[PDB]
Design a protein around this ligand. Structure first.
Ligand SMILES: *[C@@H]1O[C@H](CO)[C@@H](O)[C@H](O)[C@H]1NC(C)=O
Lengths: 48, 49, 49, 96
């Protein structure tokens, strides 16, 4: 966390920094999206 | 009377390819578009001042 | 905007398709985004005038 | 050095007085992280392909495969399954 890394979440590839977020996801949701439909927040597997 | 408007700058490769490196490699094949956009925006920016 | 591609995310296009057609999809997205950015620059020039 | 980048951008060996925009300083990534679900059981592909009897075309069979790790090389490496054409995804990337 807090470091510029290139991640891979269930085949969702990208580069950025991962930080703790306070976006109250609903149980059925998996990841959020921004205005331009790029993934903004994500729920990581095997940790929820 | 309006006098000046907002000076704006656009990162061509960041907007058009995001973080994908091979996208930038493909984008290099399209010539000097980003150069012309940067030049035009810089001209507008100095014109405002 | 997909611009007629299978997705609007470059990473998905690259991680899902064989490069011979991935390059076609990326060409579609690149040309669409470049056209939109050209339109923005032209309207900015007119407003600057 | 920064001066040489300015000459390279201007395509000139002499640079006039002023301020020039050259490039961007995008921070490179250092590490690499991959996160996948924590299941380990293999996917039941054997009984689907090695089944003794298939169903009729009008009453085609359907099997639900989930909650398992699927490796497509076990399907790939067998020669007799010749016609393997995939739509919307390359056959090589199925393992990823
Ligand atoms: C995978 O490991 C994490 C870490 O302990 C655990 O929370 C999670 O429940 C595990 N997943 C499964 C399917 O056992």
């Amino acid at each position: 966390k807090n470091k510029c890394v290139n991640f891979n979440f269930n085949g969702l590839k990208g580069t950025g920094v991962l930080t703790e977020s306070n976006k109250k996801f609903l149980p059925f949701q998996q990841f959020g999206r921004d205005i331009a439909d790029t993934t903004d927040a994500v729920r990581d597997p095997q940790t929820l | 009377l309006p006098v000046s408007m907002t000076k704006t700058s656009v990162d061509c490769t960041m907007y058009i390819c995001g973080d994908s490196t091979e996208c930038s490699n493909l984008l290099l094949q399209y010539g000097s578009f980003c150069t012309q956009l940067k030049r035009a925006l810089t001209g507008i920016a100095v014109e405002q001042d | 905007s997909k611009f007629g591609a299978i997705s609007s995310v470059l990473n998905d296009i690259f991680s899902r398709l064989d490069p011979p057609e991935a390059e076609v999809q990326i060409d579609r997205l690149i040309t669409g985004r470049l056209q939109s950015l050209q339109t923005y620059v032209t309207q900015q020039l007119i407003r600057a005038a | 050095d920064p001066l040489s980048e300015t000459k390279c951008t201007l395509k000139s060996f002499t640079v006039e007085k002023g301020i020039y925009q050259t490039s961007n300083f995008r921070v490179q990534p250092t590490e690499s992280i991959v996160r996948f679900p924590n299941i380990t059981n293999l996917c039941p592909f054997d009984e689907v392909f090695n089944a003794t009897r298939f169903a009729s075309v009008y009453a085609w069979n359907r099997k639900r495969i989930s909650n398992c790790v699927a490796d497509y090389s076990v399907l790939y490496n067998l020669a007799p399954f010749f016609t393997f054409k995939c739509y919307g995804v390359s056959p090589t990337k199925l393992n990823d």
